[PDB]
Symmetry: C3
């Protein structure tokens, strides 16, 4: 007999439990094969990919990644794909782990307002990516059409305290990283495999700050980790921790005691972690510019007792978490909305600048702007700043080096350029600085920065 | 004793069986070590990399990938490399799995019209890439100079019903993807790892349509899978199926029951598949823009009985196979030749357009141009098209959105731009549309499209 | 108990042995857990990334990669990070394998002239990358802030004859590959993952020529192999040899008998090799343009007796090692310094050209400039060259094809363009050619080449 040869479906049909990320459906907890009816609906919708940056996502079930599907090896799955009548595109589905043409894609082609169905036996146990397979396939996947399906072994997976759902994807916007507004898909960037964002669960900050995953010291955590791509291979890593186990798809091989593991485009793995020390543990793609310049960071926050014999030291994690150490960056979202409305206040800018100043500036100038005498000059009550507050725009954009004097102290160092910052970002940061620490006040606009950036 | 310590060569020397892709030489079927004489000749030659796109390939044995070499662990191999006198470049060979300097490259340097020889013992069992290692090494590999050598274990590999030879490579043309004509190698793209094509066996469509690999339900298939690079790592995947086994090079580890596996640049693996359900099973690099935008798709076609208990659904695989669902795209080849000759007819364009319309347009407008009332507007007898057939060029290149009326029905949707299409492609597709379904006829030329593309 | 539950530290504290690449500290050779005090100092310093190309590296311990740290599983490590007062940036450290927030980064933030300390228990055996984790994290890593820490199993690793330390990194210069002078970090290239250099141990030629690693026939070699990134995944390969074992981080899985293995960004592996045949064995990233166009080649040189039954052939390894076959390229370094000083002589240029001519030109024109009658035309006493020595600049930059006559012999072949060569390189090569083999003498300057390159 084939694999999953467990007998005919028994009992009543089961109408399947789908879940939204980062959560997983419960274990099926049964010892017999069932007929499982799955209903999944495609929805095309604008969502925020980053604070003040909107994108038209194409979704399975209203989320990126799509709704999580959980069945048992040997089940017969009757799959219903609906395409919402608001959709502009046709869609379909390819489930990895399906035995058949297109993994279902050949049978699930569904126009807006229609529904398709096909049936498959889940022969292969494992964790599997599913995704849309409608031409142009890459555009559909790039727009967010991917998720996971778990096919349990017949005895179920071992019990753990938490199960979570995390999926990486690469995204291609016409605009640059953190450029505000509704950003179109960019086919040229996509073909060249040059993403503007690389994210977990469809957005910057999806799993950071107040949206972190949780567990307690001593608890076990299983994460179902997908890589939807379309194009990147993840050097998937947990900062400050180790994986007890890493298992790809339905593979017989299991790797144990590793921290860094390569996930193919379209690949999926199950990882397991045991919490040992409190704090924030960071899931990243260790192709590091993805993690720290394009959004590829997610957090597991562990609460419980300290273990000073295992780890003893200070906890200044804003030095690397930067602007994602805080609970959120809602001040940026709000400043952007107010700017679109034409109602942007000085305070709107100050609070957005405060959020962005973390990491970006604070690593050298400190959270309080004091700097460090002789090494980093102060922004707090800075005579150099007050002498020519406009020149601060050039300093941020193009850097500063050479001998300067600030508040009666000599400096001879190097501030790197930060040209990657967008005009609103520079404007907001500088407005924050001007309105803090007894600086002269006033404001810098995005338009001011635009003019300075354009100077030869 | 070293590995492969099986005794001295016995018997008469064996003059080795080389094969062209996608076929493999027979199992050596012997229990003793032999002296094996291998003769391989380099040939530089123009071949079609895509329909109407020529490239000057540099080849081992006249093909990309090069001729497959099959020996037994413990054999002594006397390797003769000839370089055809028509060659312009010198060449050599590095066989992975060889124990010695350059894997042979140090001893096989061969000018045009010359022959070299070196001898090695095959100590290491496994599947191995070989390639040219002549400066500039990357240019030689990019031009197609790679293949596989199998070193069998002494007892042979387990018997299977079919053995096939598939090798991925990344290619670098001065022109864009599907731009017609003789395309030079592009060193700048190659250094930047920005390929224009990513292919199996040296050409788009090498293993699709009427050139698919075959097997029957119940049969086992072994594929020797190489990645010649030069630069890309393949997220190697089979759509709608699973690999029973994946083994890299001569490694002791074997992974079982996986669908997606990472093959390094210069890597090789042996995969095994058991056919379970009829249909087309697609080998891809799941860095998806490679598979669906740059040519990285190959097909294994399985014939036999349906198994509706395992898979039950419709078979509309043109939705993802697109223009590669058909037996071939020879109409494109022919239209391109006629265009070069100055003898391009309306019918030449119509048939080339018909081939390209599959996937590219048919996913929304349907194979018969009818569209779907209220959702996708018709191209069949389209009053909107007839009203300004020229505007169709702008629609294809730059998309269309907003409210329009077509054949007495209102539409308010979005047709994405398709700027990646080349001028001949747009011209041919539109000529096909104009001459089908009682549309007004006439034709669009590549030159017409060029003018429209150049408008600001 | 956790992992590494071996008891409390015993004995006196041990002040740890750090080593500079390519060497490793000795095995700890003990059976009890210790308190180990580690002192590591950050130094920012200019070094040569390539001959005549300077870069401002940021280093742990004065080298790239940083000093190697070696402890035993179950040790308590008291980590002191100093930041030299000459530093312009703050720094910190994240050690993979540490159980705690940021792998230490949260507790080791250190301004110039300061010192930090934190303590951790080494629970996890394995080889691990460490790196700086100070915002912007990618810039710090790109500038060279990474190394390895080995956490031994309690019984120690098996004995071998040699242990070496090799770490790959990708680097991002404003200038192009081999463009001379002090090269700034290029943030735009880094974000796009488009490195100008890909190196082992921080420099082109760090481990080639007279800086090769050594062993003898019959000896075992262990290499601790890191990939610091920041961005690339290495298709890590040894030319002409095989790895007996490859083990990632602290993983339970060990792969045996492979030649090509994928190392994630931020990953580390221990590989083992047994020397069998004399010669030069090349460690490369087999994304081949990295290895042969961006510096990603290192050498293990094996001395001892020939084994003609295993490998019998000539040894012309300059065909692929090119300009790295020689002991060094010091003539390039010297010519560049003299050019900066305004004291560049004809002889300075001749010797620099001689070094660069290897591989680059010699593969076709031969080491003695004789070429091959009818196939490659001579540079030795070339009438074609003497007829218009200036035209040689265009020939190098833009190639040459078609019918020509040289020293009374007809040629009809193709010399590819070599536009990637920098102006000084072309000038030096041509000066070498003009002053060798009874050619007319004189010289070509970088400024001459610049003018020709700029012609339309
Ligand atoms: C990596 C260190 C570092 C970072 C990050 C950094 N700076 Fe600076 N900044 C400096 C140094 C050093 C100087 C002094 C330069 C010199 O010696 O020529 C400086 C100078 C300045 C000055 C002028 C002198 C003064 O004290 O008024 C301003 C204004 C300033 N920085 C603002 C910012 C802002 C705003 C940010 C973030 C957007 C930022 N800097 C990020 C190191 C840094
Ligand atoms: C993903 C869906 C999709 C694809 C693929 C697509 N179209 Fe369209 N096309 C549309 C939609 C929707 C409209 C109507 C746009 C609107 O509502 O503003 C349209 C409009 C048009 C029109 C004008 C209206 C009409 O019916 O005459 C033409 C002509 C056309 N398409 C031709 C093509 C051609 C040729 C191709 C392929 C090269 C193509 N389209 C590919 C969705 C698509
Ligand atoms: C891959 C082969 C190859 C390489 C590498 C190469 N050449 Fe050539 N070179 C040729 C060929 C072939 C010709 C003749 C072209 C023709 O037939 O039109 C040529 C022609 C020339 C000529 C003009 C004819 C003559 O003999 O004087 C010069 C000068 C020359 N090469 C110099 C160089 C220099 C300097 C280098 C390296 C920087 C170089 N070449 C690298 C193949 C090569
Ligand atoms: Cu879709
Ligand atoms: Cu897929
Ligand atoms: Cu070659
Ligand atoms: Cu190789
Ligand atoms: Cu640092
Ligand atoms: Cu790290």
């Amino acid at each position: 007999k084939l694999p999953g040869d467990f007998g005919p479906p028994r009992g009543e049909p089961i109408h399947a439990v789908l879940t939204s990320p980062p959560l997983v459906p419960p274990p099926v907890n049964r010892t017999y094969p069932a007929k499982v009816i799955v209903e999944l609906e495609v929805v095309e919708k604008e969502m925020q990919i980053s604070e003040g940056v909107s994108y038209t996502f194409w979704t399975f079930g209203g989320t990126v990644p799509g709704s999580f599907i959980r069945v048992r090896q040997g089940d017969t799955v009757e799959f219903h794909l609906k395409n919402h009548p608001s959709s502009k595109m046709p869609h379909n589905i390819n489930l990895h782990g399906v035995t058949g043409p297109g993994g279902g894609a050949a049978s699930s082609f569904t126009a807006p307002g229609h529904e398709s169905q096909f049936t498959f036996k889940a022969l292969n146990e494992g964790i599997y990516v599913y995704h849309c397979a409608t031409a142009p396939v890459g555009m559909h996947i790039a727009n967010g059409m991917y998720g996971l399906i778990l096919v349990e072994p017949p005895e179920g997976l071992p019990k753990v305290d938490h199960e979570y759902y995390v999926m990486q994807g690469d995204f291609y916007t016409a605009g640059k990283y953190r450029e505000k507004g509704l950003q179109p898909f960019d086919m040229e960037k996509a073909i060249d495999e040059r993403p503007s964002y690389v994210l977990f669960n469809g957005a910057e900050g999806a799993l950071t700050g107040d949206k972190a995953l949780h567990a307690k010291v001593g608890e076990t955590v299983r994460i179902f980790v997908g890589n939807g791509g379309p194009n990147l291979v993840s050097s998937f890593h947990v900062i400050g921790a180790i994986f007890d186990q890493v298992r790809y798809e339905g593979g017989t091989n299991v790797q144990k005691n590793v921290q860094t593991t390569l996930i193919p485009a379209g690949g999926a793995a199950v990882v397991k972690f045991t919490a040992r020390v409190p704090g924030s543990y960071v899931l990243v793609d260790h192709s590091i510019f993805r993690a720290f310049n394009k959004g590829a960071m997610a957090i597991l926050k562990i609460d419980g007792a300290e273990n000073k014999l295992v780890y003893s030291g200070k906890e200044l994690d804003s030095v690397y978490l930067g602007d994602r150490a805080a609970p959120n960056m809602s001040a940026v979202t709000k400043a952007t909305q107010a700017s679109v409305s034409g109602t942007l206040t000085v305070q709107d800018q100050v609070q957005a600048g405060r959020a962005l100043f973390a990491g970006t500036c604070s690593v050298c100038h400190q959270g309080n702007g004091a700097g460090l005498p002789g090494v980093f000059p102060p922004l707090a009550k800075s005579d150099f700043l007050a002498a020519d507050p406009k020149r601060a725009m050039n300093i941020v954009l193009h850097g500063l080096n050479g001998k300067i004097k600030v508040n009666g102290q000599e400096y001879d160092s190097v501030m790197p350029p930060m040209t990657q910052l967008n005009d609103d970002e520079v404007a907001n940061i500088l407005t924050y600085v001007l309105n803090s620490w007894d600086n002269p006040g006033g404001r810098v606009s995005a338009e001011d920065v635009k003019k300075v950036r354009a100077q030869p």
